[PDB]
Amino acid sequence: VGRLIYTAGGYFRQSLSYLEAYNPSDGTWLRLADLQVPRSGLAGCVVGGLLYAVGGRNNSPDGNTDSSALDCYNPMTNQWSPCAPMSVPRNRIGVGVIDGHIYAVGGSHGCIHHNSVERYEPERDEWHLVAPMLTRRIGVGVAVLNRLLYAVGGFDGTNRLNSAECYYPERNEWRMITAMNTIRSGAGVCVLHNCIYAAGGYDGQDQLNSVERYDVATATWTFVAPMKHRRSALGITVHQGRIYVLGGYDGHTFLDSVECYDPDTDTWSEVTRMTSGRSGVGVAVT
């Protein structure tokens, strides 16, 4: 009870510092302490009641700086603190948590299109390199299922990807899985009831409203109901058995639309609006 959807950073004309939290119970938005540095193309995650803001970029009017930063938010203190930075800057990053460890997956540093992956141990405040992905992936979506980390879609420096791969932390190795039916970079990727969902993204021509679900048993991707709005660089999370997608770019506009997926009825509904339209946010629930 009383867990909130947090949204951190994002982009509208420049990278933003906002940290806001939505309560799906009462439909209320909280305005919380700003990030110390503006960030878009970051990822959000929660470990032991703390929210982490990982990687991304400060896209200023001045210019662009890719971020290696890891910053920790305590909802009890409403304060951001720096943590150990990653080995490399990672903009358009994917993250997932396994057993209280943060995995920072691919992303970019200028022309560098990362295949590398690194793991954070909060108790030691250190990062270590682990096995690299079999593909370079920026704009990659990450999901954790059955204690395996999945990396889905992205861009390899030449090709936009429908490919996906699976990381085995005990073995420290990656394996290609069944590809998506759609090429998707900047997709929202999340886990709901033992399925991976990949919602929206960009196929190289258009922003997508399509949604595919991965079934681990049959190892296949199937389409479910599409979103009302085409969106890439969207935020995504799961709250009480439902998927929330936040913002993104629809090909013309930076969206403020929050849609909600009910797996029971296979329908999307608009549930609220962010206070302002933005893409490339980091989202998590605690």
Ligand SMILES: COc1ccc(S(=O)(=O)N(CC(F)(F)F)c2cnc(N(CC(=O)O)S(=O)(=O)c3ccc(OC)cc3)c3ccccc23)cc1
């Ligand atoms: C021009 O039309 C497109 C084309 C592909 C995409 S994307 O969603 O596939 N893609 C992934 C990839 F790297 F693979 F190309 C991404 C592109 N840009 C991001 N941002 C930061 C950045 O430019 O570095 S963003 O949210 O601040 C942003 C900023 C401006 C914008 O105006 C077009 C759209 C977005 C990304 C941030 C997170 C994830 C992927 C990002 C988006 C828009």
Ligand code: NA
């Ligand atoms: Na994810």
